Design a protein around this ligand. Structure first.
Ligand SMILES: *Cc1c(COP(=O)(O)O)cnc(C)c1O
Ligand SMILES: *Cc1c(COP(=O)(O)O)cnc(C)c1O
Lengths: 443, 443
C-alpha cells in the first residue's frame, strides 16, 4: 500500500534517519535530496553516529571495546579506521593493502589482527615488522613461513589458528557436518587443528594465544555459535590435557546479521552476547579449563545499517510480460557496479523515495540499473507506488557493508562518492572517480 | 590424466599460444613466465594478432568490417579502440565514459553506435554534438528527449530502435516467448515497437534507419538468430506496408560464443554467418521487401580468446571433505576481484601450468583466490596433477571478455596489469593499480 511505502522502518534505516512531514528523509539532520544535488548521484551516505553506536553496542555486549574487532572487508577507509581507533576497537585486516590503509590513518598495529588464506612473504614481513597484534594462521605453509620471517626479525609473533568446527550458521538454521569443504584453516575432526596447535607451540618465533573460527552469516541468535564454541572448546580441553597449555583467547568470528527489509527483525546484540558468553562460561567450567576471553569480528553489523545509497530515477516503463500483464521497470543511474549483491547472492534491499511522499496506486515494480545487461537488477519484485518518476531520488538502505568494497568499473562507470554525516553537516570521505582516473592507467 | 593437462587445447587458448618442449607456454613468442616475472601477477596478457584476426574473421563473414561493431562492454581501453579503428570496425558504446575513452583514442565518432537503457541528457548531448553514427533508442522517453536534444543542436540524429522479439538464444537451445520480461527496448508483440518506429519516423530531428535486437549468449549456430530475424523482419514488412518506410539496416546484436573448456567446439563464424545472411535474404524476398544490411555486435567472440590471466600459485592443502576423502585446494594471488564470473554466473574456465610440465598423480582439485570468503573459487571441481605447487605459474584461458571490466577492489586488491604481446615483444596497456590509487580518493 501507498501508506507503508511512505513510512521508514527505523530498524532498517540508519538510527539518525527521519521522515519529515514534507516526505523528505534526513540523516543526522541533513536532507538527502540536498546531498544528492551537492555531490551527484549515485551517492553513498554514512550516518557516522550510527556507525559509532554499533561499535559501542558491540563493546558493551562483549565486555569492552578491545574484544571487538571491526572486519574491514565490509568497508575500509582512513576515516573509518580512525573512528574504529577512537572507539577503542580492534581492526581485522586481510591483505597488505588493508594494512596499508590502517597504518596510513594512524591505527595502532598492536590492535590489528591479520587474516588471509594465502599470505605472501611480503605481507608477513610487513605484519611482523609493524608489530601486529595477532596473525591468524590458515595453513601449515603459513605457519612455517611466519616462523622463518619472525626469526629473520627480532620478534616473536602472537598467533591464532583458524579451525573448522563443522558448523555453518545462517539466519533460520545452522548446518552441522564433520568437515567443512572450504579453503580456510584446519579441520577440527581430522586432528589437523590439534597438530597445527602443536606445531605453533613448538615454534620458537611464534606464541600461540588461542583459536579462531568463523561460522556465521546473517545470524540472529547464538545457537550455531554455541555449538561451534562447544566443539572448539573440546579442542581447548585436549590442548590443556595433552600439552598442558592454557589458552587465554577464543575468537568466534562475525556473521552477525542486520535487517535489510521491513519484515526482518533487527539484531539484539546484548541477548546474543549474553547467551553466548554464558554458555562459554558454563562449558569451560564443565571441561575443567579457564574460560577464555571471547573475541568477535563484526563487519556487516557495524558498517551495514549506517549507510544508504541514493540514486536518481531515470527511465520508467510498463514492460509487457504476457498479453495484458505488465511490470513497472524503474531505471536508476547506478547499478551492479555500485551494488553487485542482488545479482551475486540474491540479496533483497528496502528502497524508499527520499525526496517526497508517493501518492500513486501501488503496482508490480522492478528497479534496474543503467548497465547493458539483464541481471543488472537491484530490486527484483515489489509492490511500489506507480507515480515514482524521473527526477525523484530513491535510496536503498543498509548499503554500508560489502557494496562499495565490491564495486566495479563495468561499462566504465565511476565508483561513487562516499559522504559522511554528523550533527547536521556533511564531510566528503571519498571523492567520486573520474574518467581521468580510468584513463590514467593507460599513460 | 597428466598427459591431457600438459597439452594446450588450440581452440581455447590464444591463436598464437604454443606449448614449448620444456613445458613453458609462449604467446606471440613471449614466454608467459617472463611476463609474470617482469610485470607481476596476476597478469592479463592480450595476444594482439589474435584480437585482430577475429576482427578479420567477423569482417569477412558479415561482408566487410563496417558491418561489425565491437561490443566495448567486453573490454575497452584507448589501445583496443585504436585496433578496432585500424581494422575498420564500428564500435558500440554503452555509457558516456566508454564514449570518452573512444574519443580520447581518436576513434571516429561516425563509426560509433551508442546503447543504454537509461541515457541521461548529458550523454545524449555528447553523442549528438560529436556526431555518432547511430543512437539505439530504448524507451519512449529517450526518443522524445533525443528529439529535443537534436533540435537544440544543428542536427538530425540517425537511430535504431531496440526490439524484443521473444527469442533467447543459448548454446544448446533457444527459448521462444511472446514477450520478454527484461529492461531493454520495446515489445514486438504488444505493438509498442511499431508505435516507436511510427514516432521516430515522425520526429523531425530523428532519422530511423533500422531495428536492433540482442537475443543471444554463447551461441554457436544460427537457428535462434534466424527465428529472431524472422520475427523482426515481420515488423520490417509491417512498417513498409503500414507506413511506407523501407529500412536499410538490421542490427542482430552479439551473443556469439567461444570455447571456454577443452570439451567445447570453437565457433565457426563463416558457417553461422552464411546460414543467417542466406535466411535473411530468403525471408526479405518472401515478404517482398529490400534485404537490409545486417549488422552484428560481437564482444566476447572478438575479445575473449585473445587473452589469458596469469597467476602465481601460493598455498596448497589437502582439505578433508569427510573422514577418508580429501580435496586439493590450490590458492592463487588474485581471485573474484579480477574474475567475478565463476561466482556470479557459474562459468567454467580451462587452467594450465604455463611454467613447466606437470608429472604428479591426478587428483580432485579446486582452485581458489586469495580473498577472505569461501566462494572465492576460480575452478570449482576438476582433476589436475598433484605436483602443482607454490611458485608455479598458472593461467586461465579466455579471460579477455568481461573479466577485467568487472574487476573490483575487494579487500583492497589492486586491479591487475594488462600487457599486450605481438611479434615477440610485450607492451604495457594498463598499469597495475597501487595503494596510492586507493588512498587518493580520500585526499
Ligand atoms: C567474513 C568474515 C568476517 C565478518 O563477516 P560479517 O557477516 O560481515 O560479520 C570476519 N572475519 C573473518 C575472518 C571473515 O572471513
Ligand atoms: C551484451 C550485448 C552485446 C554483445 O554480447 P556478447 O555475448 O559479448 O557478444 C551486444 N549488444 C548489446 C546491446 C548488448 O547488451
Amino acid at each position: 500500500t501507498v501508506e507503508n511505502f511512505n513510512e521508514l522502518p527505523a530498524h532498517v534505516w540508519p538510527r539518525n534517519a527521519v521522515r519529515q512531514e514534507d516526505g523528505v528523509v534526513t540523516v543526522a539532520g541533513v536532507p538527502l535530496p540536498d546531498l544528492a544535488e551537492e555531490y551527484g548521484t549515485p551517492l553513498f551516505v554514512v550516518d557516522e553516529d550510527d556507525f559509532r553506536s554499533r561499535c559501542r553496542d558491540m563493546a558493551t555486549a562483549f565486555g569492552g571495546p578491545g574484544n571487538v574487532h571491526y572486519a574491514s572487508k565490509a568497508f575500509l577507509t582512513k576515516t573509518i579506521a580512525r573512528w574504529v581507533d577512537e572507539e577503542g576497537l580492534a581492526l581485522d585486516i586481510a591483505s597488505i593493502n588493508e594494512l596499508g590503509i590502517a597504518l596510513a590513518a594512524g591505527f595502532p598495529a598492536s590492535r590489528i589482527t591479520a587474516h588471509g588464506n594465502n599470505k605472501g612473504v611480503e605481507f608477513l614481513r610487513a605484519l611482523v615488522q609493524n608489530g601486529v597484534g595477532h596473525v591468524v594462521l590458515d595453513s601449515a605453509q603459513e605457519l612455517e613461513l611466519l616462523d622463518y620471517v619472525a626469526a629473520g626479525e627480532g620478534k616473536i609473533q602472537d598467533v591464532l589458528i583458524r579451525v573448522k568446527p563443522g558448523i555453518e550458521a545462517h539466519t533460520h538454521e545452522f548446518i552441522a557436518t564433520s568437515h567443512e569443504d572450504q579453503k580456510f584453516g584446519f579441520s577440527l575432526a581430522s586432528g589437523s587443528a590439534f597438530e597445527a596447535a602443536k606445531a605453533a607451540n613448538n615454534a620458537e618465533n611464534l606464541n600461540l594465544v588461542g583459536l579462531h573460527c568463523h561460522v556465521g552469516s546473517q545470524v540472529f541468535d547464538a545457537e550455531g555459535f554455541k555449538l561451534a564454541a562447544e566443539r572448539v572448546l573440546g579442542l581447548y580441553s585436549q590442548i590443556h590435557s595433552e600439552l598442558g597449555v592454557a589458552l587465554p583467547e577464543l575468537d568466534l568470528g562475525g556473521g552477525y546479521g542486520i535487517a535489510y527489509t521491513a519484515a526482518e527483525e533487527p539484531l539484539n546484540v546484548a541477548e546474543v552476547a549474553s547467551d553466548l558468553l554464558t554458555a562459554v562460561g558454563k562449558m569451560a567450567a564443565e571441561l575443567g579449563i579457564d574460560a577464555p576471553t571471547v573475541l568477535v569480528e563484526p563487519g556487516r553489523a557495524i558498517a551495514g545499517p549506517s549507510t544508504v545509497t541514493i540514486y536518481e530515477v531515470g527511465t520508467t516503463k510498463d514492460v509487457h510480460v504476457d498479453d495484458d500483464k505488465t511490470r513497472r521497470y524503474i531505471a536508476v543511474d547506478g547499478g551492479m557496479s555500485d551494488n553487485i549483491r542482488p545479482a551475486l547472492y540474491g540479496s533483497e534491499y528496502d528502497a524508499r523515495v527520499v525526496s517526497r511522499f508517493a501518492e500513486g496506486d501501488p503496482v508490480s515494480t522492478r528497479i534496474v540499473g543503467s548497465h547493458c545487461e539483464s541481471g543488472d537488477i537491484l530490486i527484483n519484485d515489489e509492490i511500489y507506488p506507480s507515480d515514482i518518476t524521473s527526477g525523484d531520488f530513491l535510496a536503498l538502505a543498509a548499503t554500508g557493508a560489502y557494496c562499495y568494497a565490491m564495486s566495479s568499473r563495468y561499462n566504465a562507470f565511476t565508483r561513487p562518492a562516499v559522504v559522511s554525516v554528523r550533527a547536521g553537516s556533511s564531510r566528503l570521505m571519498l571523492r567520486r572517480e573520474t574518467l581521468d582516473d580510468i584513463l590514467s592507467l593507460e599513460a
